[PDB]
């Protein structure tokens, strides 16, 4: 939330649903990385 | 350097030489003599330009009242017809049969969607429509993203099908009527007669994105004019996908706006700035909107959201009352994503009585709260619209006219007034046209006042085109000379009818398209703007014309006579022409119509020839096998009779013209006698010249070709070898030199063009022209313009014999008014002949203007094309310079200095002609440039708008504004 919340304001039209904007959603995003499932796509959004 | 008397005496022997060559070889005094020798083949009638204007003002009244009656009946039927519609939903059981435009007409297709059944129509080809058409039914346009077969759409094609009987009753009564169309609230449009749409959906690869609701004609009759004010939320939360969406909605929202509508655009993030340079509500014409659509784009989101400073700034903007304003519907629309504050306090005072209407738009996919925004919309009798997507922008930024139309549909019959649109290009490629609109209202159960839930919307709008080629048939210019014309005007200053007005759209800015970002097959929008050229932009502006222009916006009558300068047909000359204007109002409408005449055009020739042999004898004069003793004759494509058509291949036309008089006597019971007759009389007058005068002197030495461009279209170049090089328009009322010869009382020289293609230099030569000038009973007439193409080689020999060929001491040149180079001493200059003299030695030309020898006026041509700049053609503005003598003084001596050198130039003007002779020391002795002073259509982007609108042109708005009915529902958002 401190690193990536409010920061995924891309002027694309694609949806980046595993983000850090709320605490429930941020929570959903961390558990996704812990399973390993598509964790690099979350990391690609945080680098951009 | 020779003295001023030596140049004086040496000009006078070579302006006496050119004029004697032109007075003798052309035959000015001979053609004057034979117009006066006869006196009785014709009579001389007056142009009563009080009377002519009054007569014209009434054919446009009756034309536009006849259109109006048709519009009223269609509206009545539509209202009555839909009040008896039952709203069925079983459409696979009972098919709706209609012909759908933009569908393959191939019989073997057979798609057969459920609910609907198509028509294969038969499609005769037509005139007054330049496309194949069917007169048995009306076509239907469904927009592309709208599905047809929806119950909402299927039920229009049911009830709207009773219009084809009233459609037919309008054209039976009036054959000349153009498109008749009903634009539905549903987005479905039906027009008669049926023809295939110009863009099919998927059979080519360009796809139409045309919506009836979006259309300007539909919009003006949808609702009343309006002062809007777009607020843009620029807080930090918006940045992202949502910010991207807003910039495209506002541009989209504007498309909706019209000239009668005023609009500004503000933006807030804890302070409200205004997006551009304007600060008040501006006219939202093509230009102003272009400024706002160019400042909406550069916005960056940053900062705290404040709806209190955003609506304070909005209300203050709404209350200016010093500026020119629409003063009708006052509404403010805010684009934003989510709001935590309802700003209850700002609305209490600023709009305690709800005079203003507030529309709130929530855009993008986001989680911000929408309850406060919805509340604002509900409180203010506005509406709420979401936009998540780009495909959602187009139907929500046009949909607010359903709200603004409400207090019009509660006005009853008082709201059913025909309004006529600005000229614009027709959807179907007809040409420039104006549409008269009327709104249809949804009346169901009126007898008893049973519902009214959705009875506060319009069913749609009904329109009927007038083509501008139909109005130009009520304003005949043939009796009047090429100089005379009729100009039509809005109460907005735009010109309904003008010689200068053109089909190409009026352009704004310098066009810049990026080739690195345009895909090879996606098909962007082309254009939709109206062609709003203004009267002070169709003609050179004066102060004594802004008086005339304002005086006939506020519906007055009058005349005016003054000296002003006419821009030439080609854009190279300016000639001081003493004109008279005369205006009157078209009493049915808000148009006022005027008429320009040049004193001396107050009398015309009517042909009074009726004898059997005399009309016969003059008619074989224009036979193309008989050009060996007559001269390569031409003929202007007038609409002589209805049957023989203007063809643009002139040998084609003159055969079909001259076949027509042999196969039938010129009495011709469906064809105007005077126009053909005058031509016949004229051809017996440009014959007796070519027989009894020009064929005596078969070769003059320096004379190349000899013409008589006359009134009656018949131009006669004298050898057929010369007539191949005659590159003029064969219509005599479109020739540039014809019109410059009439203004002047002296021989006129026309400079040949520089570069280009075709032979226009040594081969044809520089031409002199001169209007014929006769007096009948003390009444001035100018019937014709004689002339000569000169031989440039011979002229040089006379000129050579203190200037010598390949001279290095000093060079001398002859320049006609406008500064073009005709004759040059050096031989590196006479290769570049007909070129603007400020491009071959720009230092001298610059000085000449300073001495007061030359004057000029830069103007803007708002209808021209140019190549794009990197940042096939678009429309753009060009600035155009013309040059003209402003000082009557004959001679001008002096010296110009560049820095470290002097050059002593001597200038003398030849008497009796526009030509000027200048002697100066060789350019090579002082190596000087300044910069190259060039005279061309030069792409530019002026005038700057932000300075026009601080002192706008006078204007008059619509008298009736419908808004704020007390019994409006104001409960649906
Ligand atoms: C360049 O200068 C020459 C000589 O002035 C000029 O000449 C033609 O010159 C001859 C020389 O006498 C003229 O005779 C000739 O004019 C005609 O004949 C008599 C002369 O009095 C008169 O009827 C008329 O002047 C004229 N009419 C005729 C013969 O039909 C004169 N004209 C021509 C073209 O032969 C050139 O025109 C000068 N160069 C140009 C054309 O600028
Ligand atoms: C909208 O579509 C409906 C469905 O096609 C049209 O209703 C149809 O109207 C015609 C003439 O008004 C009816 O024909 C009549 O049929 C009766 C027998 O049912 C016969 O006695 C009459 O002499 C005449 O032939 C037709 O039946 C009727 N269909 C239904 C289902 O009622 C309607 O006319 C269309 N609306 C418009 C404005 O065109
Ligand atoms: C002109 O106004 C009338 C009402 O003043 C509009 O008619 C109304 O159209 C609605 C369309 O939603 C009809 O409601 C529908 O009812 C059917 C039952 O037949 C139901 O299945 C639908 O879910 C929907 O509720 C309604 O019947 C009808 N009202 C009346 C009084 O007839 C009409 O649409 C307006 N004209 C146009 C061209 O839109
Ligand atoms: C336009 O309508 C006006 C009236 O609104 C006409 O002005 C009338 O002109 C007639 C003679 O032509 C006078 O007898 C009347 O007195 C005038 N009206 C008034 C109220 O004074 C005008 O002639 C019409 N012009 C055209 C071109 O139709
Ligand atoms: C068009 O050119 C004429 C030149 O003949 C300009 O008229 C002169 O304008 C100056 C100021 O620029 C005045 O001092 C003179 O009194 C004017 N003379 C005449 C004869 O009118 C005219 O201003 C030019 N028009 C534009 C728009 O620049
Ligand atoms: C202040 C701002 O960002 N607005 C920009 C401006 O800086 C820029 O000069 C102009 C042209 O690029 O477009 C807009
Ligand atoms: C077809 C052709 O050669 N066109 C030339 C053009 O390239 C040149 O710029 C111009 C000089 O003004 O002369 C012409
Ligand atoms: C009306 C006018 O401006 N006329 C002037 C004249 O006074 C002057 O003698 C001449 C030479 O400069 O230029 C011109
Ligand atoms: C452009 C030009 O010729 N400028 C001259 C320069 O050549 C010369 O050296 C100088 C001194 O006489 O005077 C100046
Ligand atoms: C107007 O309508 C009448 C009646 O149909 C007709 O005689 C007249 O020619 C029409 N005028 C124009 C300009 O169409
Ligand atoms: C303009 O009017 C004056 C005064 O009537 C007249 O002398 C002059 O000839 C007119 N202008 C032209 C170019 O004829
Ligand atoms: C004439 O030239 C002088 C010196 O270059 C300049 O000051 C003046 O402005 C010029 N006159 C006009 C009418 O521009
Ligand atoms: Ca996994």
Short mmCIF file of C-alpha atoms in Angstrom, two decimals, chain A residues 9-13 22, chain B residues 239-241 243-244 247:
data_model
loop_
_atom_site.label_atom_id
_atom_site.label_comp_id
_atom_site.label_asym_id
_atom_site.label_seq_id
_atom_site.Cartn_x
_atom_site.Cartn_y
_atom_site.Cartn_z
CA UNK A 9 -2.35 5.29 -12.56
CA UNK A 10 -1.50 4.27 -16.07
CA UNK A 11 -3.07 5.99 -19.05
CA UNK A 12 -3.65 2.63 -20.69
CA UNK A 13 -7.06 0.99 -20.87
CA UNK A 22 -7.40 -0.89 -0.80
CA UNK B 239 -4.97 10.92 -13.39
CA UNK B 240 -4.89 7.53 -15.02
CA UNK B 241 -7.39 5.91 -17.35
CA UNK B 243 -8.11 11.49 -17.06
CA UNK B 244 -7.64 10.04 -20.54
CA UNK B 247 -10.20 14.88 -22.65
#
